[PDB]
A paper describes a structure:
[name] is an α-ketoglutarate (α-KG)-dependent non-heme iron oxygenase involved in the formation of the l-capreomycidine (l-Cap) moiety in capreomycin (CMN) biosynthesis. The overall structure of [name] shares similar folds with canonical non-heme iron oxygenases. The catalytic iron is bound by the 2-His-1-Glu facial triad comprised of His148, Glu150, and His295.
Five high-resolution crystal structures of [name] in free form (CmnCapo) and in complex with l-Arg ([name] l−Arg), l-hArg ([name] l-hArg), α-KG ([name]α-kg), and l-Arg/α-KG ([name] l−Arg,α-kg) were solved at resolutions of 1.49–1.83 Å. The complex structures were obtained by socking crystals of CmnCapo with proper concentrations of l-Arg, l-hArg, or α-KG. The extra electron density was identified and unambiguously matched with the soaking components, l-Arg, l-hArg, and α-KG. Thr174, Arg309, and Arg313 interact with the carboxylate groups of α-KG via hydrogen bond and electrostatic interactions.
Numbering used by the authors:
A (entry chain A): 1 to 338
B (entry chain B): -12 to 207, 216 to 338
Amino acid sequence: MTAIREIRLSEPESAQAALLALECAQRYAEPDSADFLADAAVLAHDLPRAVRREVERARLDDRLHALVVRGNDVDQDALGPTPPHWRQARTAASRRYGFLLVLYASLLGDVVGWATQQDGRVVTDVLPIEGQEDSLVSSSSSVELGWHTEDAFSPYRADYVGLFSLRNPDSVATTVAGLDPDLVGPAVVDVLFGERFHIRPDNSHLPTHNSGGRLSDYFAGIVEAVENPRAVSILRGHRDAPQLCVDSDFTTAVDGDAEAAGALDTLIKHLGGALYEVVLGPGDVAFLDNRNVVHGRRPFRARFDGTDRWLKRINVTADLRKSRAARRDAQARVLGEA
Amino acid sequence: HHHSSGLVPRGSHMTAIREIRLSEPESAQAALLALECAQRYAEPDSADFLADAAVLAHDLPRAVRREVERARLDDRLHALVVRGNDVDQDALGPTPPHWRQARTAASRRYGFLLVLYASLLGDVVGWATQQDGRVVTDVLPIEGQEDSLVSSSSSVELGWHTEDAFSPYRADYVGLFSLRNPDSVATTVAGLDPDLVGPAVVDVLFGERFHIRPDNSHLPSDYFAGIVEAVENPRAVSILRGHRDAPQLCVDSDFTTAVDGDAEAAGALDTLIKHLGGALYEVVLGPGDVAFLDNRNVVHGRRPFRARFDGTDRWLKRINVTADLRKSRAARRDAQARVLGEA
Ligand SMILES: O=C(O)CCC(=O)C(=O)O
Ligand SMILES: [Fe+3]
């Protein structure tokens, strides 16, 4: 209904947001520099008032699918070519969009990264990588990004996933679905509320999607969660507004629970059909409510000529304090550094 | 009457107290925002105001917002104290004789300001079983409840505790806005210094070896069934939680016991009760002073004091703040409602 909340920036609101981002770029080294992240929540208060009003309505809407902020300024000429790999995507020209993504995000909560994702960067990159066309990770193209709750396996999974589209010349859709409980059956719902499923870390948490020199110890937690998954529910909270936690490629029923394996089969067919498209054009920022929706990305053909689709991505928590056991120190934002 | 802020240590807790002193212009700016809110919105906890409160709070003085944000992310904070807000004592009128008479037109602006400060730290919540589910509550002495074990006490020690220690929906912060305090009556505060306790005791306190039962406050429904089960069939819980370097504390000096037959846990618990009792210090809020206690880090209580019941007694506005409103949705009526156990 209001499941998708959209704000289209006026030209002045777009210009004001860009100016704030560019002041941040002048002051701080990286969009996830510790001194910037300490200051971000209060810097975000200087974003346009009309934007702050609508973000706050989104934040307290427990039936949100996504907040979409359209029409941020992106200078395509100044940005330069789409990097061929996330490792090379921390470009001088792309800093300003990282800073703006963190400012928007800091209206919804606190930004976090993962020790086991893109070398523990808090601002990450989504771009097609040659040789990953058919992979199950966000650098895919030819094969759909299978729908998932972000970091479904983890009790420290984000409350919001933020995406800042820098470029999307072929209008490739982000896919989104919620679960209408009164639509699969209060029978299947009860089975999904039961701690009767295994959810494993997706392939982006593997050493193979990180730099080779990363501490083996960062991946201890990921390997444990692959080998010995905890028995967990797919639904939780109030029955009038249950939260969703499932990954289409990394969820199984606990072996010998055909009632569970039956409900999961049913959920996977349902959500696959229910998946709807949101197209993020250049300058469009989305925050997906990761408690309410699964998301993915349509298949596309990458041209690998520097013109390809490029997003900046961020994880947002409503409650940074709750993850302190998994972080190095109070201010550190990288889950699994502890 | 210049802006200042700093860190006041207590024992080995180097950032225990974060103190902010408003300049006259910062005081006036906060007061004008609160007064504008009181003109535009029904109540300090009406749906119209709470939907906007987190954004209206961005209009508080910038220097105060930066220092509050530093407090919010300080996982070793005991108390954030903001001193020097305007209270017009003449216009406020006498301290009401009961909380049921305390939601006065004259005191609205102080409820609004408490919610604005609170909304810099998180989202305000109340409890169906406390002061009729009001989010902005009143702390004042009630004639005939001098010997009481609730915040309306005076002659008797309010025994110290984590706020709502039994509950998974317990506040992350307890906020207090002092309207008057002529006799400088204190809130007592204590955190755990792991350096003053045997590591073996600390190891036991991290164990799920304890029962934390609700005060009789709670108790009257799927919510209230959970309260009865919390008294009769209490879950086994830990007292310390999270990172060894920055553990959260959850204990109630009157309502915590070790699990049946766990003498070692009974020993660790009473070692902790003696430690916190010995480590208690005091925070006094003068008129216009606001405090947020980090309920994840400290227990709090109150010393004996002498109430006059003549309209001059100590009066605070009080609020519960959560870092994560969404996690309590099963215990609230609808998305925007802030009253725990209202559904
Ligand atoms: O490319 C997209 O639109 C989605 C990316 C994504 O889901 C992700 O990287 O987590
Ligand atoms: Fe994703």
